[PDB]
Design a protein that fits this description.
Chains C, D: One of its GO terms (molecular function) is structural constituent of cytoskeleton. Chains C, D: InterPro entries: Alpha_tubulin, Tub_FtsZ_C, Tubulin, Tubulin/FtsZ-like_C, Tubulin/FtsZ_2-layer-sand-dom, Tubulin/FtsZ_GTPase_sf, Tubulin_C, Tubulin_CS. Chains C, D: It is found in: Cytoplasm, Cytoskeleton. The structure is cut from a larger assembly and holds 2 copies of chain A (429 residues) and 2 copies of chain C (435 residues). By secondary structure, chain A is of the alpha/beta class. Chain A has 3 domains: 255 residues, 3-Layer(aba) Sandwich (Rossmann fold); 110 residues, Tubulin/FtsZ, C-terminal domain (60s Ribosomal Protein L30, Chain: A); 53 residues, Helix hairpin bin (Helix Hairpins), CATH 1.10.287.600. Chain A is built from 15 helices and 13 strands. Chain A is globular and about 60 Å long. Chain C is of the alpha/beta class and 435 residues long. Chain C is 42% helix and 13% strand. The chains are: A alpha/beta (429), C alpha/beta (435). Chains A and D meet through α3, α8 and α13 of A and α9 and α11 of D. The complex binds guanosine-5'-triphosphate (2 copies), guanosine-5'-diphosphate (2 copies) and magnesium ion (2 copies). One guanosine-5'-triphosphate binds next to α1, α5 and α8 of chain C.
Amino acid sequence: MREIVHIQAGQCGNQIGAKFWEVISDEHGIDPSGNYVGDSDLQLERISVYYNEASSHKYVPRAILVDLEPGTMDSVRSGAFGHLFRPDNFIFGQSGAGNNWAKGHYTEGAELVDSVLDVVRKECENCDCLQGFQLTHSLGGGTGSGMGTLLISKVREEYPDRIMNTFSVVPSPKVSDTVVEPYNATLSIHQLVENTDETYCIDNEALYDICFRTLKLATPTYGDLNHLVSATMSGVTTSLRFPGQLNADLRKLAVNMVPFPRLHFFMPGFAPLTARGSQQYRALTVPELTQQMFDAKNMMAACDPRHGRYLTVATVFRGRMSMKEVDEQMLAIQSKNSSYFVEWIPNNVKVAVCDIPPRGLKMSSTFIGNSTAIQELFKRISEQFTAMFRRKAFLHWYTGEGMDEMEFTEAESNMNDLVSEYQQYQDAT
Amino acid sequence: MREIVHIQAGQCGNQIGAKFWEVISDEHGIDPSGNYVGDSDLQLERISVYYNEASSHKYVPRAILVDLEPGTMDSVRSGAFGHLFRPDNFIFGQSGAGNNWAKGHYTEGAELVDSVLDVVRKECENCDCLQGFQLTHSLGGGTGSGMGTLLISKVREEYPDRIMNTFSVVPSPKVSDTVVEPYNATLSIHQLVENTDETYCIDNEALYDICFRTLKLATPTYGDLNHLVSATMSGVTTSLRFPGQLNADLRKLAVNMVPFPRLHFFMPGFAPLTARGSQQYRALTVPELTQQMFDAKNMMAACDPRHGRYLTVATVFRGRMSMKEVDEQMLAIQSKNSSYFVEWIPNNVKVAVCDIPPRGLKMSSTFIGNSTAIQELFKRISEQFTAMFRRKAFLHWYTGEGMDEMEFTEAESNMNDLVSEYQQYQDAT
Amino acid sequence: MRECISIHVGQAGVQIGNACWELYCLEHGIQPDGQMPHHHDSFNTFFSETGAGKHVPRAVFVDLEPTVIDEVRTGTYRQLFHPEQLITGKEDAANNYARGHYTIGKEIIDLVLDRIRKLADQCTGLQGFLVFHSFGGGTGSGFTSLLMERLSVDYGKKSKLEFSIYPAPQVSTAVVEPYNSILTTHTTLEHSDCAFMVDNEAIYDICRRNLDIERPTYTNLNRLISQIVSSITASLRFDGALNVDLTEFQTNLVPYPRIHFPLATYAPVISAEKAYHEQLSVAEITNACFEPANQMVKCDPRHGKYMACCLLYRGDVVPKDVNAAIATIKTKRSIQFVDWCPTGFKVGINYQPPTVVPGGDLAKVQRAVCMLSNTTAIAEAWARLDHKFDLMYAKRAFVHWYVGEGMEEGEFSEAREDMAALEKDYEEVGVDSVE
Amino acid sequence: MRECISIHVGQAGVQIGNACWELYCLEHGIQPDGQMPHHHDSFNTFFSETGAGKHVPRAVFVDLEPTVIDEVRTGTYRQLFHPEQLITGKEDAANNYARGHYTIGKEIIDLVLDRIRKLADQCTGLQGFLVFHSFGGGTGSGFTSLLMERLSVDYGKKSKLEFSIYPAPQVSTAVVEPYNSILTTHTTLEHSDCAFMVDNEAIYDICRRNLDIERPTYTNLNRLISQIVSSITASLRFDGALNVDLTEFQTNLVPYPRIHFPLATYAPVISAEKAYHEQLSVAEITNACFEPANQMVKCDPRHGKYMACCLLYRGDVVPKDVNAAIATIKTKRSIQFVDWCPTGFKVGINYQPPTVVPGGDLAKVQRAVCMLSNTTAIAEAWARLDHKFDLMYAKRAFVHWYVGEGMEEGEFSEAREDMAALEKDYEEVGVDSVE
Ligand SMILES: Nc1nc2c(ncn2[C@@H]2O[C@H](COP(=O)(O)OP(=O)(O)OP(=O)(O)O)[C@@H](O)[C@H]2O)c(=O)[nH]1
Ligand SMILES: Nc1nc2c(ncn2[C@@H]2O[C@H](COP(=O)(O)OP(=O)(O)OP(=O)(O)O)[C@@H](O)[C@H]2O)c(=O)[nH]1
Ligand SMILES: Nc1nc2c(ncn2[C@@H]2O[C@H](COP(=O)(O)OP(=O)(O)O)[C@@H](O)[C@H]2O)c(=O)[nH]1
Ligand SMILES: Nc1nc2c(ncn2[C@@H]2O[C@H](COP(=O)(O)OP(=O)(O)O)[C@@H](O)[C@H]2O)c(=O)[nH]1
Ligand SMILES: [Mg+2]
Ligand SMILES: [Mg+2]
């Protein structure tokens, strides 16, 4: 019940999804062939929320992998944990978006979106009581951004009741992996604030810094970062994929973390994060995790929370623990950081507790903070956009697909409206 | 009892029949020599409906293979599963119809039709309680079309009570395997709407598309298409060739699917259709088959049903299943597609259930839809005919055999009358 | 059991027959002496058989100059032919239609018809006739007109296929080609079921450009045309996924009784050194067939409209690919059929691959396609002949030979009128319909 | 399944192609005869395959002087190329743009386009075009202008990448380089998606200083440029941690439609004896790429502003180090991007290490980086050409050849105006914005 459907757009989306399904299968004890070899019945008590039991007692992910080029698709397909996806789900195009959002949302995407929606509809009808959708994508690449926004708009048209999650890799503040990413980012944010229930802003820069400083890895391959983000998502869903002393679902998180329709952007965080040697030299206590999850150096969004206020906060633990301990820790952390919280929201911490650790560990924790600091991000992007739009650089590439200047004008206006609202609620009284 | 006689006219008819008898023998466990080596008594409990028990405990098909040229006849005879036909049935001519309908219905066919009718009569007298006839032919080739129409007229004269089935390969919309096929098609349709109980319109284009897209075969040889159509026919007859929780026969299908005498043209469909690898990755559930059988991409007639209305629908399942499941699926599919059905016919789905799968599978299904979409087909053909008749191209070839222009005038008038009736009943209220 | 005799008239006919029978003997593994050390019977359609392992062709070699026939009798295929089939005249018509149709051929026509009737009665399921003849030579045109008239009188409704050699627009070995061509066409227009236009100029171009042979002999062109004809009759002589008879050819490719002049084309034609570096896609070879540079008549097809097409495939062919390629061809713009014929294709598929003759020039290919296409561009070619005729008639040149050899001037005027009427009918078909 | 053909025009193009295809055959373990004894398909993007184990390139070799093409046909890579791809003219344009664009090339352009269309239709996921041509030679400039116009007419929106050879400021083998260069640039300015500036003078300097080879042959420069192009297409042809297509190149490196002239640079380039004594740090090789002395165009980058950069890495590369190195580059002062583009980088990472050609000059390295950089310093180079043009036009020198070969003087004036307008646009971009 509460079946969840997974969508993966863009190269980053597909890679993250591959690592994610690896992690999920490892949690549920699922062989690479797709059949179960696990040991605990609770694995299969809710295997149906993410998997479908194909006949002859096999399991397939309920995912939909989308692309405009066969490269990364085939790369995943050849790799292990690839031969379990149902092959009909691999929808891909040939032209390639060329890292352009206009192609990914007007010209190229408009031709595959129909087949994608058909597969979506088939999967929806297969499910018993649909819970919602989770989209894994970037915001810079043309395919991910454009096609994901298109699919989100279409789905929200076809499902104004279900829940929607997006795991977008926001561009880093310092570096810029592409050149035209401000345009795609602005348009994608426009569509997201239009029709998304919640958005999980994530930066590669913060992941780099976490892997280097905290985990003491000077050689972080993209596999590591994708593994971390996948662990985060799995921790998000484990509250319903497994029993718990205080269970939660996606709907509860949306209710608790979104006081206003537009202000649904969240910075995540995970704990504990220990090196290979520096692990046994620390006590794995709930206060330790709690204090770990509250600092700049462990936020997966490159923005110091101290610059703003924590509008809302959610926290999902795992494994056996004592509730009173968690309550006391949350109380202390809310007391000591009094200046860092919204005045008119008392007791702004949502708590969920699972019974299963993410494996290997005794107790883990996931943090989802909706703060006012993230506005800086948008501010930054907005400024950049204006610059690149004042000289109308690269404007012809997007113009040639039917888009016009007024599109960018409206998107920038909308972004500045959102920034104004965020600042307004930051200094509310 | 209820013995059935098989007629195969034209090259296509003979090839389809060869594949068909291969499939039937495989179902009943019949050695290529024609003797039984099977394992289940139910095979021989109704072996007599299609076979005759020749002495020394052998079995012969109750078929009548007809042609005007020895080529394909001899090809089949040399091939395996050929040495079981009784050789006296191989009636063939020497002149060849030359892909002309006039030859196949006036000059050349009039000389063999007598011997063919004699063999038909002998077989009829051999049978105990005749059920009806099934004719396997094309509509483009001269021999198939012309001689089949002639035999149909003669038989209906000699048997105004029995039942008649025709499996005609209708010309494809896009391609045209011959040049003069509109003329033969029009005349054949004239004779069919005259004296046929039911006609199973089938296109090679749709079969190509099904083999390529669904089954993932880029190299479809005619053997594959003939195998598919033969599987369809076998599924049609299995309801009486085997026991069933809700059995049906040809007469029941004719009663249910033919509300009006002329409107007896049906588009078939089959399910499930899975690739070699993509099979285990799907659950073989009755809802899955049901939803599979209702879409454009699985109709053996090249016409989108959404363009018209499903006047009537019949569905024959096989293997063990739960009746309530089928009932619920039919209910849901009739509810969700409310705009796609005739208003004044409530509950327009006929259901039959067998106990034996077609081997290899757990459960299969066959769909026979009488829709208003197929009129487009005729419309298309009609237009083409008019074109080729306005300039009177090729008219001399048919004229030279005694046929006259008024023949084509009447046939086209009749076809347009049928089209008018089909459209009239499409938008009835 | 579906027999079809072969008739070779004139020097061109006999040489082409030499090539064709070499190709046939290679196809069925038959020694030159009729012995032999997927196949069905197959060879029965063109080979008759005696008690021993010796088979003979169902062919007739007729000529008025004994030179080439004597070469055949001395050729390596000596033991093959039944000696009665080698009818030889004494004095050739010498590029004079009158001699070839009134004076000389009139005196052996009866013996020729006698041998024809013998071979017909010995056969059972006779499909029809195959005539191999040039157009300019006196024997070819004259004897062919006479033979077609006689056959139509005797064998009313049976297949009669012709393989003329259309005189090139610029390469004319004879000088009086227009006269003989006009006369033989005006006569044969009312008897021939279906002709097959081929010209030597186009074959020269193809041999040089594609096969990369700069200096070809007549043997090479004969090999090419033999390959074409073998592809034509492979359906009768072999098992295919979609077979086709000559009756189907005449039915499909002839919309109007007079307009029965389809031109030939074949593919693939590449050198053995160039056999690699190309996979020979079925769509690829279809496009090759439809290219104006691969046709065997010097007429730009883009100047006319394909009234009908017939594509015959042999080898490892799959129907769906054929369907796709034909659809793609129909999509293209420069190929504009007549509006009133929306179905401009008949297809034929065979399993037997084409066989390459050792000591040949082509390369062993797994698939092959022959296109017999009846178009409207051919009309223009007639115009050229028309022009020349008028010239050679405006001065009454060369007339005296024809007059003094059993002909009248009003006959020439009538032949010109008939050719003009045919061109008029071609134009009339070329127009589009209203409403 | 993402194909991209190669087109080689002129002597420079053909020799560069020789080197490039040697490098490719080495990359995929392909014999010169197309046989082969992490990899995916990979080679499918540039190699087509027939039934046997024989693969052919998707290349077109066109020239007007048969010398070099004949050398190729006799080269060790003889069995490789499909013989139809080796289109040879008869008389070279002889460093005359008019001949190469109006007189001679105009008469084989149709056949070239025919072969192009054949190879395009045989492919499915065609990404775009790769043109290899010089700038001074008559065939190069003329035939290239004609080819680009034809392709833009036929294939509207597909990738069209060019590899010009920018004439050196001082080493000019020809004498009329400014005329041909100005004409071909004025023409190609409205069709080319993205050019790739490279010059022989800079490559001489690099070969002497870094590789420590004092006396290099053209083969060595060809090897270098082949390495560059292989790095460019490795993303398509191999699996990488962050792949990139040519569409991304044109999107990222072209801010304005006219300004699409990025220059190339590659690293590491050290001798095998000097392969040791340096660990080849990723930041180290990045700094090497950004050094003005390692660029392949004789233009001091410190005189312009990097409007865009594209760094493509292959081998044992880790993203965080790339990020750190790029941040450090952004920190430095002498690298001043345009104010209005704060994001001046697109990155590409591949797993396949670069392959060193046996008998080569470079050393086997574990990592490599190619930088395609669109800067503003290139504008100055145009000025130099401008200058020379004016000189050779102030005296009307050499004009008579171009005039008498199908050109008018007003065309020269128009080309000068267009080059001046381009330089004006470069200056206009060079300024900073107010507010
Ligand atoms: N394609 C082809 N044509 C040939 C060949 N040999 C002769 N011809 C044709 O024959 C013509 C020469 O005149 P013919 O038709 O042979 O005259 P004939 O057959 O000798 O009969 P007479 O005119 O009475 O001598 C030329 O126009 C050629 O087109 C050949 O080997 N191949
Ligand atoms: N980098 C490099 N450039 C070359 C090489 N070979 C020739 N070139 C260039 O070719 C130019 C000589 O004129 P080309 O462009 O080759 O003239 P072409 O290609 O022979 O065409 P035509 O001018 O018509 O003869 C020189 O300026 C060189 O820059 C080479 O091996 N490497
Ligand atoms: N965190 C993370 N980000 C990635 C990964 N791969 C690609 N990306 C990001 O995805 C963006 C490229 O978008 P991409 O999907 O490749 O382009 P598209 O095809 O147009 O959607 C870059 O900005 C990268 O930062 C990965 O493995 N992990
Ligand atoms: N589906 C299918 N159709 C066939 C097959 N063989 C022939 N046909 C069709 O039959 C038609 C030819 O008719 P044919 O019987 O050969 O000519 P006839 O001798 O005059 O009756 C063509 O339009 C083909 O589409 C086959 O194996 N499968
Ligand atoms: Mg002669
Ligand atoms: Mg040159």
